[PDB]
Amino acid sequence: KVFERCELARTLKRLGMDGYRGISLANWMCLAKWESGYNTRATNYNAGDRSTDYGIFQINSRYWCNDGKTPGAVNACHLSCSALLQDNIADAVACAKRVVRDPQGIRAWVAWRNRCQNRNVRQYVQGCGV
Ligand code: NA
């Protein structure tokens, strides 16, 4: 499913993402936008290390979910990577929260650093009623 901007903003707010570990909703929106264009079915294969980024937040199989095909990988979110391609994003949100409950926080995603860090993200939640 490809979410509409405000549809997603309210979806993430209902899931407890607004201010989660200090990260405003707008930052999560900016992340989803740049990672997948708000597409829950987005996947990206990394030929170099044989891992795959899954879903709306493009969570990587080397550390976060299990896909059975990434050598020496772990599964910190304790989920099948399949859970990260669901139209319903509750599992992906639980995993994204897990990701930020680590040393870097929202910085774990390079995309956030490139297109969201120190830029205006309020535009992503404008008019969404959040
Ligand atoms: Na894995």
Topology:
Blueprint: H1 5-14, H2 25-36, E1 43-46, E2 51-54, E3 59-60, H3 90-100, H4 110-115
Antiparallel strand pairs: 1-2, 2-3
Helix pairs in contact: 1-2
The chain binds sodium ion.
Architecture (CATH level 2) name: Orthogonal Bundle
User: Which hetero ligands occur in this complex?
Assistant: sodium ion
Element string (H = helix, E = strand) = HHEEEHH
Total number of helices = 4
Largest sheet: 3 strands, antiparallel
PDB class: hydrolase
Keywords: Salt bridge, stability, hydrolase
Assembly: monomeric
Entry title: crystal structures of salt bridge mutants of human lysozyme
Give a structural overview.
The structure is a monomer. With 130 residues, the chain is an alpha+beta fold. It has one domain: Lysozyme. The chain is 30% helix and 8% strand. The chain has helices spanning 5-14, 25-36, 90-100, 110-115, and strands spanning 43-46, 51-54, 59-60. The protein has a three-stranded antiparallel β-sheet. A hairpin with a 4-residue loop joins strand 1 (43-46) and strand 2 (51-54). Helix 1 (5-14) crosses helix 2. The radius of gyration is 14 Å and the shape is globular. The chain binds sodium ion. It catalyses: Hydrolysis of (1->4)-beta-linkages between N-acetylmuramic acid and N-acetyl-D-glucosamine residues in a peptidoglycan and between N-acetyl-D-glucosamine residues in chitodextrins. The active site is at residues 35, 53. Pfam families: Lys. Its EC number is 3.2.1.17. Residues 1-130 form the C-type lysozyme domain.
